[PDB]
Amino acid sequence: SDAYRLKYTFGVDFGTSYVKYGPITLNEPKMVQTRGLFLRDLPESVKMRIPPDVLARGLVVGDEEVRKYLSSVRDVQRNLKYPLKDGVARRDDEEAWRVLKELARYTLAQFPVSDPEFAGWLVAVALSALAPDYMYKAIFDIYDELASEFKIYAVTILPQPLAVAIAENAVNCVIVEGGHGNIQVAPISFALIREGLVALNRGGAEANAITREILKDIGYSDIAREEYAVEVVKRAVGLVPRRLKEAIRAAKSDPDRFVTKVRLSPVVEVEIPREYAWTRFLIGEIVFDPNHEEIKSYIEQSRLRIENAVIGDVTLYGEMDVASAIITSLRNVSVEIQERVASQIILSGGAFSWRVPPGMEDVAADSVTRVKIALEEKSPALASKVEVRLVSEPQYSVWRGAVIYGYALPLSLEWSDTTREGWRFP
Amino acid sequence: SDAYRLKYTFGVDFGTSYVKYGPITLNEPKMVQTRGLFLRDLPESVKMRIPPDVLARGLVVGDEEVRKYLSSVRDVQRNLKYPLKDGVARRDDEEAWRVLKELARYTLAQFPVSDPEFAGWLVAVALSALAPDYMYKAIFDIYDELASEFKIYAVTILPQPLAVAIAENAVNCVIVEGGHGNIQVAPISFALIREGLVALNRGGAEANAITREILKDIGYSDIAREEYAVEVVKRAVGLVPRRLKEAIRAAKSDPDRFVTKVRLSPVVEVEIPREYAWTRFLIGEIVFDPNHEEIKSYIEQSRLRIENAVIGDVTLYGEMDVASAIITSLRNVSVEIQERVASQIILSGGAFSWRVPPGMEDVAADSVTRVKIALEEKSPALASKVEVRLVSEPQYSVWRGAVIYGYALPLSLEWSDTTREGWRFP
Amino acid sequence: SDAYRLKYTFGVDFGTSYVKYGPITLNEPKMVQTRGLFLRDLPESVKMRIPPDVLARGLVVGDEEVRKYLSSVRDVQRNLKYPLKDGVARRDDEEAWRVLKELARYTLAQFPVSDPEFAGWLVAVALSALAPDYMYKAIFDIYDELASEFKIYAVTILPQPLAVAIAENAVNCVIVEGGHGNIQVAPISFALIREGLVALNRGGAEANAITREILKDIGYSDIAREEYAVEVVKRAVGLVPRRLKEAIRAAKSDPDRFVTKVRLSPVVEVEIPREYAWTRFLIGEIVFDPNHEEIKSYIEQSRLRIENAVIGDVTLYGEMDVASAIITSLRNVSVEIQERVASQIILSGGAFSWRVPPGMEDVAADSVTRVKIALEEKSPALASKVEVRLVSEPQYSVWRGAVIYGYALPLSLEWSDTTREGWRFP
Ligand SMILES: Nc1ncnc2c1ncn2[C@@H]1O[C@H](COP(=O)(O)OP(=O)(O)O)[C@@H](O)[C@H]1O
Ligand SMILES: Nc1ncnc2c1ncn2[C@@H]1O[C@H](COP(=O)(O)OP(=O)(O)O)[C@@H](O)[C@H]1O
Ligand SMILES: Nc1ncnc2c1ncn2[C@@H]1O[C@H](COP(=O)(O)OP(=O)(O)O)[C@@H](O)[C@H]1O
């Protein structure tokens, strides 16, 4: 039906960090941190303390639902699984979708529907652009299973940048998503340019890993293991330089500006010492231009120490700067239209967030000011006409696009594997 | 069976001082002071006076059973064996378990069962967290031998802090056991955190040894040798300072407040003189924070005199404060949950008992008020939100947890050496 | 000059345990156990007994120089500072470099130079790969101060694995250092692969801490506090299993093979009892593969007891096996060359030492045989072609590389912070 959509059209975003979800009726979507928590090796002592309903399905997911079941850090680095490592779950990983299943299951269960006119939801999923074929097939399999439990009339999937352009309803610009895992820049002329869509393998999660290194170098290593901890630290102590080299010089001259103290929990309060105060810049900068002799040295000597198993989640080989990303995304649109499409740049998603702490504007920079000054370095003639803008409520964006897309996607259009578009029915 | 448990589930605690025991049916457990009494070198004169049944097994154990067989102090410091010196019996000591055997034998024999429906007990043992592997294997060997005498259907063992958390059924807090021998602090989130469990090697028995030194300095040394004597003295004359340095200053200014007279027996009545009246504080304080230039001097110069053999049971090297213990136990749980788990602090066990004698509240402090003020000194930001509580009937606690754990521990779960959990059958 | 180098080129290694040092002229370097001994709280009684020269600088360092100033164990666990806890001194610790200063000062003072042609030394320092930026800057500050005292023409610093590859002058292999604090595995093709260099945070010092636990479980705890004591015990009683599980099974079947008696001092002679005889394996094994349900249980229940302050120096979260370390270090070199570079494996450094005591070869294994059988478990196809070798004089190695590197490092090459290579001049 039609007005049936304005109620029961149900958007879902995944991305890496937060799974943003809700029906179209919401003003802004509810969030679930993507982490699933396994309950797997349990001393029968603790199984006595777990409700047999929760332990039955073998996981728990959601912000509040997991917090209650969290044991010590050793438990966290084991049984707390962040699937969607970057935008994507490796096929071979059974634990990867096992959480996504009950993460998606948690999503719908959160919103019951009393109305007997309810024929089942309309589930608009927004995956990352990097999502391969199997990740589509896998997640439709997920919602096919929830069809037996919940009422789902139809399921669709849209690439994440497609949502944002729909969310902004912007006519001419290059969308840039700050997605935690991946940065997806797409130009849009009258709509997405699928050929010009460019999605980096880098994201906010690379700002964690550059923080997760700092907290190891300060001797907080117990804190590093817990991903929530570096999150709070990164978000609080992370900072974006105007120009990295000029900034680090500044922070080594007058560190007292940059020394910060973050209270994670009453026991553990992270003090960024006087010396490393300049490393605050590497935290927020590595999202944008992770090519510098200053970072690429600091990341290299931080790749040496291998604590548990992982060598660290980050790439030593170097990536493309989001300045160079936007440019590369534009060379794929037509020279006719490039003057128009390169006018606006919409920054969106999480990793473009950073707010300059007050009084520090002479050195730090907002994500907006960063991109604008990033273009001046590479393509000067471009940065003249560029008006770069950050979305209001950056991370809520993709979901707002997911429902609008999900709202108008004529329901007689079947999902066909070849076109990778349209509804599928259970 | 099931309702069979609500009767014949049988909890046993050991700990150092009192072995707390009984079936689940009891309101509070019966106690046996852990002391075994050897009858070993007996002039045939006295063997004539001993029933040949008692002398046959070579020991006696229990409060009333030993009192009748106690000879002079020389006999007490010899043939009265306190096993479980701290939480643990050294493997090499045959006398150590030989008492525990007949101490555990005394425990079950105390409770005969008339009902022919009785298939044997369910013995839930609570050992100290410090109990090594052999101490588990040794005590199962004990109950395997009592299987031939008594009816024991199944035997299990739980670490002592696991009991308390079950006894309190507290969801978020850090348990602190005042166990006579050892202080075992564990955080609990939905249940014990085995990684965060921290057990000090210090306990109430270190408050004896600091009293046992005082009674030597007052010239009562005949009284010191008898462990029951310092017990009654410690419990009566022992006291817990608000702040040790401020307190000792007070007690040296106005000693008449603190001069006390304890009647042990009609012959021997201990008068804490006017001078040492300040040493009452070191008695109760050394349980909490045994690092002070005032104690660590007094314990050092009291380590010099070596009377019989032992140099004294106490550590000159210094230990961790229970304030620092709780903190160290929290750094092992996840920064996510630390805000919640650090809220409540449950004090339990014997060594957190002390009651301020009336009118003295301006200087002394209850164990509760002591811990709360202990945290303010170390981790100020923690002590703001901390609500610290003492268990009603502090020492009875562990047993109450031992039965509940012993009540539900599904009986098809075998004891497996690797997991160190579950029932074993004889 | 040139031939001036063949005399006055002066190598210095730090590492954790032994600081190996000497001029290039030596056959093998002289050693200094890294321990500094503070003289800090001294009763004026003892200051009368200390030469005012020694007490002036406030420390003493060196094997013989400290032995003479050692008081009781309480003094040792306080005023005997092992800096470089693992490979690294925490910035905030003033006591950390204060020893390194006079430790390095002790080093040069040991070797006076009579020749008036002597223009000052050439100091080649070998730090650990984990050495951060500040640890470089700190130690150059050290040698800048010794420039006023001694004659130092030039100072350089090389990462420790760089030395070994130079010391061996091996063309194709993966160096593995058994460094007391840390295990640094690097592949070398025509030289070090800085990207493939992988340095574990585990080392011989984790074999102490697993012995330091054993000596607490045997009741020698007075002996545990003294790091020299566990050293001699570890080196003597420590043993490396062929396969840990198969070995522990063997040692619990026939303990009389493994019961050992080590004479530390005429008073104290450590008898590893019959029972724990199997724990000899955990001593030497935890260097290699500290992931086992057998160790990771024994280390966990040994982390509970906290004696003085420290919870114990060791990581409960688990580390990477040196088998998996070598593999992870190879995935960073190019698939073209991996066939060649994975041929030889040079084991080096202290923690790869262990000699099977005679007649026990059926169960124990040399460090060589251990690594070779370690690879067979993980990467079978690799272990076929692998020829693994241990350096002759394992621990002397890094210094031998330090001088050769220090010998040819063209002196017109300045130290530049960015490249982290080359000479600096005072
Ligand atoms: N105030 C902030 N400053 C810096 N980074 C932030 C801030 N708030 C959120 N973030 C980052 O944004 C990320 C959220 O992005 P997200 O929408 O999950 O991307 P996607 O869902 O596409 O993977 C978080 O992982 C976090 O690291
Ligand atoms: N009123 C009191 N004041 C101070 N200490 C007390 C008091 N009552 C009991 N105690 C101490 O508590 C101890 C009992 O603790 P207990 O339960 O035996 O510990 P565990 O059993 O774990 O070893 C006794 O040794 C005694 O010293
Ligand atoms: N025979 C031996 N058996 C086992 N371990 C040994 C033996 N000899 C020395 N070791 C260990 O080797 C270590 C020396 O390594 P070292 O060269 O100090 O490493 P680094 O200097 O890189 O820190 C000592 O700490 C000791 O524990």
Author numbering:
A (entry chain D), B (entry chain A), C (entry chain B): 5 to 430
Tell me, in the authors' exact words, what the paper reports.
The similarity of eukaryotic actin to crenactin, a filament-forming protein from the crenarchaeon Pyrobaculum calidifontis supports the theory of a common origin of Crenarchaea and Eukaryotes. Attempts to trace back the origins of today's eukaryotic F-actin filaments led to the discovery of crenactin found in certain organisms of the order Thermoproteales within the phylum Crenarchaeota (Crenarchaea, part of the 'TACK' superphylum). Hence, it has been proposed that crenactin filaments share a common ancestor with F-actin. In Pyrobaculum calidifontis, crenactin is encoded within the arcade cluster of genes, together with four arcadins, and has been proposed to be part of a cell-shape maintenance system.
Here, we present the near-atomic resolution structure of double-stranded crenactin filaments at 3.8 Å by cryoEM, revealing their close relationship to F-actin. Crenactin forms right-handed, double-stranded, staggered filaments with a rise of 25.6 Å (half a subunits' length, hence staggered) between subunits and a twist of 198.1° (1-start, rotating between the two strands, equivalent to -161.9°). These values are very similar to the parameters of the eukaryotic F-actin filament, with a rise of 27.5 Å and a twist of 193.6° (equivalent to −166.4°). In our filament structure presented here, we observed a dramatic rearrangement of the hydrophobic plug, moving it upwards, towards subdomain IB, by as much as 21 Å. In this new position, the loop interacts extensively with subunits of the opposite strand, essentially the same function as the hydrophobic plug has in F-actin. In addition to the hydrophobic plug, a hydrophilic interaction between subdomain IIB on one strand and subdomain IA on the opposite strand helps to keep the double filament architecture stable. For longitudinal assembly, crenactin subunits within the same strand are held together via three main areas of interactions. Particularly significant is the well-conserved D-loop (DNase I binding loop) located within subdomain IB. Folded into a small alpha helix, it interacts with the previous subunit via a surface usually referred to as the 'hydrophobic groove' in actin. Furthermore, the ATPase active site is also highly conserved with key residues, such as the nucleophilic water activator Q164 (Q137 in actin), in the same place in both structures.
